[PDB]
Structures are given as C-alpha cells and as structure tokens.
Amino acid sequence: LEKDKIKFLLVEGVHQKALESLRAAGYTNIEFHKGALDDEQLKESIRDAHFIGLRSRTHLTEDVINAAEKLVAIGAFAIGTNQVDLDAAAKRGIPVFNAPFSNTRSVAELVIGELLLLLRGVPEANAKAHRGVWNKLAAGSFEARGKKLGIIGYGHIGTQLGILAESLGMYVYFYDIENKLPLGNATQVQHLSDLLNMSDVVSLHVPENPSTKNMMGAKEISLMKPGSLLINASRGTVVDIPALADALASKHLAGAAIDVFPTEPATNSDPFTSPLAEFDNVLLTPHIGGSTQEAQENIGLEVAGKLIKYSDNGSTLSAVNFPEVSLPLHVGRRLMHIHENRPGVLTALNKIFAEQGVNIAAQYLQTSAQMGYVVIDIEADEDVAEKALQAMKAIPGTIRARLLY
C-alpha cells in the first residue's frame, strides 16, 4: 500500500463505474481525462503508469508502448483492440484485455426500434415533413406483429434480438454456419437463400472475416422479397453498398438501416459520404449500435474488473494477446513470471524453491508459440519470497516477474 503508488492512466472518458470499481478495490492513484491525448501528452502521462485504460481513439503504438517504463497491463474499455499493437505489448509481457460482449442489448434494441419505423415508412415521412411535405398514407405501411424477421448470425446479439422480436409477436428465423439451439420459438434455416426468400426484415449479426466479406451481394439481395428491409449493425465489410443503392432506387427494397460502413470518418470532424445518403427511406447512423450509457457502464465494470483481477491475482482469462492463465487464491504467496517459451525455464523456476526446502502449493503455466506465462503459490515468509522474486528474474529467458501477495 503501495497501492497508493500503483498508477492508472484513463483516457477518452470511460464510465465513472470503472473508477468506482478501482476505488472499491483500493486503487486510488488515477489520472483521468475526458478526451483523447496527443502523443506528447500521451508519451508523458503513460511513462510512469502501471495500467492504461483507453477507448477506440488512442493509438497505443509499438513506440508509445516502449516509451512506457512501468506498464503492466492494457485495458481496451471497448470491443475493438486494433488501436493497440498486441505483439508489441506481448513481447514486453503486457497483456491486453477488452469487453467483447458488453453491449449486445444496445444493438438488439436499435434494430427493434429501426425495423418498427422502417416497416411504417417513418424515416421517409419524417424527412419529408422537415421539408414542408405532408404524406399521409396507409398503403405500404405495416405493423411488426405477424412479420417474419430473418437473423443472419445467431450469436449474443442475434439471439437476444430474437427474444425482443418474439415479445412483439414477430416470427423469428435465422441462419448460422453453425448449428444452434433455437431460443423461444426461433427456427434455424439451412440455406441462406430460403431465409432471404421468406423474411420481411433481414438483420445481419456476423463477425468480420473472409467468409463474411461482401456476404450480402447483388445476388443475395435480389433474393430478398419485393418491399423487404435490410439492416446492418454488424460490420461495414459485410454489405455491398452499391449493390444496395441499385436495389433501393429500383425499389426492390422498401428501405434499409445501416450503422457500419466500408470506410468510416476517422473523427467527428471528417466528412461522411455514401451513396445511401440520398435515400430518405434509409436510416444512417454513426456506428453507434453499441454507444449507450448502459453499455459504457457495462464495459467500465468488466474491463476495470479485468485489470484489478490481473493486478491482484495474475488472471489473464480473456486477454487477447496473451496465454490464458488463472489460479484460485488458496494458500501462501503468489508470484508470476513471463518468459520466452524454451526448455529448462520452468524447471529452473521451481528449482529455486526445491533447493531451499520451500513447498509449492499450486502452479499454472500456459504457453503461446513464443512465450510462457506461469503463476505459482509457494509457502514462505515475506523474506524468502522477496529473494526468490530476485532469483526468478535472473533466469535466462525471463521477460518479467512480480510478487503479487
């Protein structure tokens, strides 16, 4: 304590729940910033920080990282991590954590909201009325009850959209490359062409990979029904946008709602441009599918939590660049040791304790191609432990070591 000494750098305004999680766990040394940092402020604030929490805007680059001399772990208080040089962090024994599934509710809700209005032609009607034009009609406008919703991608987000969708009395269909257990009354469809053929609304919730690239093409969309609707709040590489423009202006689709795009304005000052901008029957949203207070508080708890666990017990459960290891806290003293993955290391580490008659209660080592990470609980008094820490460090191939408690 010596915890009043362990420093937390937090940028881009994470949720205050992250901060109150740290305090609750006795970590008060917090430097907090609402916005993002230029390099000279970043390189300067980070250099004596044991942990950093950032969002999607800060680039933790190989050099920024090597400029940080006391850095123990990194927390992406967000989903994405590409703003971070994982291999750079990993070579310095710095694990990186994220919040992969902490805003599925926000995405599910957005698609409900959006399909209701698109079904009803409200976006077109809303834009028209902001330009003085009144357009009252029932023809072409539908209720949601009794319509068939097709979910492409039945994961965390796809499944919970399913539930909200039944609650409103929609029939729910879905297609995954994996077989899944239908929830509520949902039905899996074998071929995508059949799902497309009988859905009134189609919503995509797939990840970003060669199999999902331009997955919704001219061909696929020609397979949706006349007057159907396409929503993409997944990833911007998933839908062929020019194919969709053609489909909107020929009126094969009645509308659409898009949140993610092949290229996205780098910041809020840069211009947004898309051929879909000229259609009033389309909703366009600045990749905000997950951008809520509720979600921002979820991520702030999970990721703040994840950092505290690692500080307090060395858990790398769910680290994205690192060997996963965690150990239930039972007995004696905890140490950890990150090193190059080569023979003899673990035996040298344990030999430090066998030689002097010290018992080892538990140990967990896991490896990646090039690196090994181990946690040991040993039974000894403070002194012996301080000293073994010292000896652990000298082991050929040692990257880093720490006495946790």
Q: How far is CA 301 from CA 43, 77, 78, in A?
A: 26, 9, 11
Q: Which is nearer to a copy of itself, 68 or 186 (CB)?
A: 186
Q: Please tell me whether 155 is known to bind a ligand.
A: no
Q: Does 255 bind ligand NAI (CB under 6 A)?
A: no
> Is 255 labelled a binding residue?
no
Q: In angstroms, what CA-CA distances link 166 with 56, 172, 197, 317?
A: 34, 7, 20, 35
Interface with a copy of itself includes 101 (CB under 8 A)? Answer: no
Closest separation in Å from C-beta 5 to a copy of itself: 31
Nearest to a copy of itself of 185, 222 (CB atom): 185
- The 3-state DSSP class for residue 81 equals coil
From CA 168, how far away is CA 145, in angstroms rounded? 6
Q: Which residue is nearest to ligand NAI (CB)?
A: 155
Q: Could you say which of 93, 123, 153, 332 contacts ligand NAI (CB under 6 A)?
A: 153
Q: Do 360 and 378 contact (CB within 8 A), yes or no? A: yes
Distances (CA, A) of 69 to 48, 64, 66, 312, 365: 6, 10, 7, 20, 25
CA distance 83 to 27: 26
Residue 262 interacting partner from a copy of itself, ligand NAI, none (CB closer than 5 to 8 Å by kind) = none
Q: Which of 211, 250, 268, 269 binds ligand NAI (CB under 6 A)?
A: 211
Find the radius of gyration of the CA atoms of the chain. 26
For ligand NAI, the closer CB: 286 or 396: 286
d(CA 228, CA 202) in angstroms, rounded, equals 8
Chain positions 118 to 177 lying near a copy of itself, rule: CB under 8 A, are 120-123, 125-146, 164, 167-168
211 binds, among a copy of itself, ligand NAI, none (CB under 5 to 8 A by kind): ligand NAI
187 binds a copy of itself (CB under 8 A): no
Residue 156 in contact with ligand NAI, rule: CB under 6 A: yes
How far is it, in rounded angstroms, from Cα 206 to Cα 246?
Answer: 23
Distance between first and last Cα of the chain: 11
Select 57 or 287, whichever has its Cβ closest to ligand NAI: 287
Instruction: Please state the closest distance from residue 289 (CB atom) to a copy of itself, in A.
Output: 10
Known binding residue 259? Answer is: yes
**CB-wise, 123 or 150, nearer to a copy of itself?**
123
Q: Are 15 and 32 in contact (CB under 8 A)?
A: no
- 302 is an active site residue: no
Annotated binding-site positions for NAD(+) = 156-157, 176, 233-235, 259, 287-290
For the annotated catalytic residues, the residue numbers are 235, 264, 287
